[PDB]
């Protein structure tokens, strides 16, 4: 039994392991929604507008998830300021603040998100009010300091209130620009949704079959108003590709206003009057593209804003697919 000093390494491994087990219990419950497109000059922008108009967004609950990020930003800023105070040898305008500074390092164990008693707030307001701290801060151009330092410190009252809801500028500054996950985690019927807006079209399949598989749902955006036949052939090839045999295809027929005008003035024969025959014909041309599977369960919706018959439909489709896939692996069928 060569357990000597080692039965501490073992102890560490089992402690990390309990943690690994706990993260796993939380995970796997996420509903992943993928926004795709961008294979053109502006497709994913149309997708974003479709999300804004028909899928709402920016609720209080999603804003609440940014509290810790705001706090973390605040903390690195205040630590940078404190250390620079120590570095330049600047003394307090009132020697009693030297006790506050000792308290500051002690009270900086209060980094318990959202514990914003009046005492902590007053400690931060008093440190920030000190003349040596202001003196160092206004010379920040001589060292490295986040530009948002003053922005946050002058608005600490609003941000630290427990009902704080981040604004659009707060979110935009949280470094979620470019690409850029494009994320929200709104709550509905006690389900936590995660929606991801990516692109890639006509040929980016190799990267997202390579990473997107086993995902809960695909949101497939189609420009309804869309050598034209080679493009149609390429679309046939991607949509109907054998590597996508076991993936449910959900269709958001988007830009319906433009599609309705275009089919009004530009005949459908370019690709292959009133809406019903042309729409039925498009459905027939698309559904004939499968040719290899018994069914796909496509959920087609005709939509107005988020205050109409749309949210029920999306949550109904997520629920029926999860149920049918739970029965698929219980011996039943």
């Amino acid at each position, epitope marked *: 039994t060569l357990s000597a000093e080692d039965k501490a390494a073992v102890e560490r491994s089992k402690m990390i392991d309990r943690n690994l087990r706990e993260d796993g219990e939380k995970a796997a419950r996420e509903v992943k929604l993928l926004l795709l497109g961008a294979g053109e000059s502006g497709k994913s922008t149309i997708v974003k507008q479709m999300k804004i108009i028909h899928e709402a967004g920016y609720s209080e609950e999603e804003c609440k998830q940014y509290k810790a990020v705001v706090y973390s930003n605040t903390i690195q800023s205040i630590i940078a300021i404190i250390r620079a105070m120590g570095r330049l040898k*600047i*003394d307090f305008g009132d020697s009693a603040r030297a006790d506050d500074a000792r308290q500051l390092f002690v009270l900086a164990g209060a980094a318990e998100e959202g514990f914003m008693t009046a005492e902590l707030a007053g400690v931060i307001k008093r440190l920030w009010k000190d003349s040596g701290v202001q003196a160092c801060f206004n010379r920040s151009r001589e060292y490295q300091l986040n530009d948002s330092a003053a922005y946050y410190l002058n608005d600490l009252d609003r941000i630290a209130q427990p009902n704080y809801i981040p604004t659009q500028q707060d979110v935009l500054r949280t470094r979620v620009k470019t690409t850029g996950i494009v994320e929200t985690h709104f709550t509905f019927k006690d389900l936590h949704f995660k929606m991801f807006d990516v692109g890639g079209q006509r040929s980016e399949r190799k990267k997202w079959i390579h990473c997107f598989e086993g995902v809960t749902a695909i949101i497939f955006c189609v420009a309804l108003s869309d050598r034209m036949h080679e493009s149609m052939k390429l679309f046939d090839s991607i949509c109907n590709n054998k590597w996508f045999t076991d993936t449910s295809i959900i269709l958001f027929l988007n830009k319906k206003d433009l599609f309705e005008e275009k089919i009004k003035k530009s005949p459908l024969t370019i690709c292959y009057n009133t809406y019903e025959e042309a729409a039925a014909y498009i459905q027939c041309q698309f559904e004939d593209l499968n040719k290899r599977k018994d069914t796909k369960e496509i959920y087609t919706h005709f939509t107005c804003a988020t205050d109409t018959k749309n949210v029920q439909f999306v949550f109904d489709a997520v629920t029926d697919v999860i149920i049918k896939n739970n029965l698929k692996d219980c011996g039943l069928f």
Partner: antibody, heavy 118, light 109 residues
Framework: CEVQLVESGGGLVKPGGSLKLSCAASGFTFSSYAMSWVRQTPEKRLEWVATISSRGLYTYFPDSMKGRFTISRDNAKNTLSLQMSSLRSEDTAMYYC??????????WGQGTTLTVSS | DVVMTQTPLTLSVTIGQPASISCKSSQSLLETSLNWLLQRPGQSPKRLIYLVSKLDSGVPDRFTGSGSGTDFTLKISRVEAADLGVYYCWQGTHFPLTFGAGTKLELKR
């Protein structure tokens, strides 16, 4: 940040004598910036004098000379004072007062020359 | 309280090639808080280089702070009229002014 510092009071002194060198501070706030004193012999070797904080919270003297030359500061009239004692001929040097420490020694004064001889 | 010494006293270098002043260090107190102070004749000594890359007031830009291991390097392509004078190298991390032998940097004629 143009710092105005005037060193004065140096001159004739006997070995072991006492003197009160002055650094007049103008162009900056006296009690909010740290101060320092340095003295130089003409013979190319430095002799660092003192460093005191913005309000005197931390003051450090060279290991070779701790306790012999003493620094003080008048925050109301904005003047640094240096009391001088136990002098030897080697202390014949010119003195510069500086704002802050060497960590921020941006400007040096003209200095006043104190010569130690009986 | 060990002293940090600049070597050599005078650095005569050829035109164009890098010129190296080596500060041999007393203590491992490392940021890069090493400073070169210069006294020019007829003028009060002035801090020249502080914090490896931060230029002090009135200081030539041709000074380059570098080095390896326990030795530090002040590199100048050509020692010029502003470079003549007594240099002292001191680590700005800890006090007092470490009294080095000083580089009497001037060009040999």
């Amino acid at each position: 940040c143009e710092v105005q510092l005037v060193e004065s009071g140096g001159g004739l002194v006997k070995p072991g004598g006492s003197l009160k060198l002055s650094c007049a501070a103008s162009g900056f706030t006296f009690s909010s910036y740290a101060m320092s004193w340095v003295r130089q012999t003409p013979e190319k070797r430095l002799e660092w004098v003192a460093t005191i904080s913005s309000r005197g919270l931390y003051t450090y003297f060279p290991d070779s000379m701790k306790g012999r030359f003493t620094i003080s500061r008048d925050n109301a009239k904005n003047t640094l004072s240096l009391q001088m004692s136990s002098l030897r001929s080697e202390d014949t040097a010119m003195y510069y007062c500086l704002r802050g420490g060497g960590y921020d020694a941006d400007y040096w004064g003209q200095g006043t020359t104190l010569t130690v001889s009986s | 309280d060990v002293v940090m010494t600049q070597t050599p006293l005078t650095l005569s270098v050829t035109i164009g090639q890098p010129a190296s002043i080596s500060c041999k260090s007393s203590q491992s107190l490392l940021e890069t808080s090493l400073n070169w102070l210069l006294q020019r004749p007829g003028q009060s000594p002035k801090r020249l280089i502080y914090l490896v890359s931060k230029l002090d007031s009135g200081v030539p830009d041709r000074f380059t702070g570098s080095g390896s291991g326990t030795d530090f390097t002040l590199k100048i392509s050509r020692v010029e009229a502003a470079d003549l004078g007594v240099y002292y190298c001191w680590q700005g991390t800890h006090f007092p002014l470490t009294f080095g032998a000083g580089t009497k940097l001037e060009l040999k004629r």
